[PDB]
Amino acid sequence: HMSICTSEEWQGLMQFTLPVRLCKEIELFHFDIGPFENMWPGIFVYMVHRSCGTSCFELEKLCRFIMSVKKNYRRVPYHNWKHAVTVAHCMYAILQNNHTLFTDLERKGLLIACLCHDLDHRGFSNSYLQKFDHPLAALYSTSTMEQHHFSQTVSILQLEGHNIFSTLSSSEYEQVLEIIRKAIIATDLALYFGNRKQLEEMYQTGSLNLNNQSHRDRVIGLMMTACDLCSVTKLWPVTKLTANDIYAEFWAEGDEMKKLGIQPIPMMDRDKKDEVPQGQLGFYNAVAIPCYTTLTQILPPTEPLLKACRDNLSQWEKVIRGEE
Numbered sequence: 271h272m273s274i275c276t277s278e279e280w281q282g283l284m285q286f287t288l289p290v291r292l293c294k295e296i297e298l299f300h301f302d303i304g305p306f307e308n309m310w311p312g313i314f315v316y317m318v319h320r321s322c323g324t325s326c327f328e329l330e331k332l333c334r335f336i337m338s339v340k341k342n343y344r345r346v347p348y349h350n351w352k353h354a355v356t357v358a359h360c361m362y363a364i365l366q367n368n369h370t371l372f373t374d375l376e377r378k379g380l381l382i383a384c385l386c387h388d389l390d391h392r393g394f395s396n397s398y399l400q401k402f403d404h405p406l407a408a409l410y411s412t413s414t415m416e417q418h419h420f421s422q423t424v425s426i427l428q429l430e431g432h433n434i435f436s437t438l439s440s441s442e443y444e445q446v447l448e449i450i451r452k453a454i455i456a457t458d459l460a461l462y463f464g465n466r467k468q469l470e471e472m473y474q475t476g477s478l479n480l481n482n483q484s485h486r487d488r489v490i491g492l493m494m495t496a497c498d499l500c501s502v503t504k505l506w507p508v509t510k511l512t513a514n515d516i517y518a519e520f521w522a523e524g525d526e527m528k529k530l531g532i533q534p535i536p537m538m539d540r541d542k543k544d545e546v547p548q549g550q551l552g553f554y555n556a557v558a559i560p561c562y563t564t565l566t567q568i569l570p571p572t573e574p575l576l577k578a579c580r581d582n583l584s585q586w587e588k589v590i591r592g593e594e
């Protein structure tokens with residue numbers, strides 16, 4: 271199945287050092303990798319290097335690995351390379367701003383996880399591949415895209431001279447692999463409402479023990495979710511254009527349903543362009559706000575995320591009310 275990088279690509283990636291005008295920019299939560307496509311692979315390296323030092327991974331091996339991940343992201347409008355890095359960056363901003371709650375082992379596990387979390391995404395929904403009647407969905411029947419996503423990483427990781435977790439004890443590897451597993455799975459949005467109702471509880475009966483593992487796995491889970499939707503937390507004009515990027519996928523899925531004589535839901539129906547504003551308000555309200563609210567509640571330093579959400583919400587509001 272697998273795709274790999276060439277020497278050209280990877281040895282260009284080592285040779286990259288990030289401009290200085292972008293160093294403080296990158297440490298923000300609202301930061302926008304938008305105009306630096308060019309730089310994306312290197313940004314991922316820069317972040318890895320700061321978080322986990324410049325000797326967690328053999329540079330040669332990490333570079334090769336990052337570029338190959340890239341080679342496996344399909345050219346789809348939203349669930350593509352750009353989505354992976356944006357998400358990763360966000361996880362970086364969170365790791366950096368809680369610089370003592372997480373292990374070196376999670377920090378690297380997690381940034382890796384994000385980069386890989388939507389690997390080989392087709393631009394179709396779990397729903398859609400189950401609904402009718404895909405081969406991928408006749409092997410992973412639950413959280414389909416997500417399991418695939420994980421299988422990809424794991425095959426990439428095992429490719430010749432890509433394994434970046436090599437120099438770890440074979441049960442410290444059988445550990446960071448286990449982190450990444452749950453990490454990516456947690457981004458099955460269906461899983462999130464359960465997971466977030468659970469946390470909400472724990473916190474508010476003062477019973478959330480970060481010492482207990484299954485507790486860790488939950489918060490991690492929410493963090494992944496939180497990064498996964500973080501489009502909502504960039505500044506308004508950024509967020510606007512990312513939304514355009516999402517419906518392009520949805521409307522494509524929805525068009526393929528129509529083609530088969532059927533009624534796509536309102537979200538994936540393009541003949542409903544201008545229901546979107548409210549759609550968004552809806553999303554924000556039942557999804558985003560509770561997400562960032564519960565993550566702000568657990569990890570207070572991430573409040574800058576909740577604030578950019580609120581700011582965006584009332585921008586979609588002005589839009590629905592007719593004043594933007």
Ligand SMILES: Cc1ccc2c(c1)nc(CCc1ncc3cccnn13)n2-c1ccccc1
Nearest residue numbers: 499501516536537542545546549550552553556
């Ligand atoms: C006509 C219409 C209708 C509903 C819609 C909609 C458009 N759009 C959405 C949400 C769309 C979405 N799914 C992931 C992301 C990530 C960033 C931004 N949006 N977004 N819902 C919605 C709203 C509430 C709950 C679930 C989905």
Ligand SMILES: [Mg+2]
Nearest residue numbers: 387388457458
């Ligand atoms: Mg996903």
Ligand SMILES: [Zn+2]
Nearest residue numbers: 387388457498
């Ligand atoms: Zn994703």
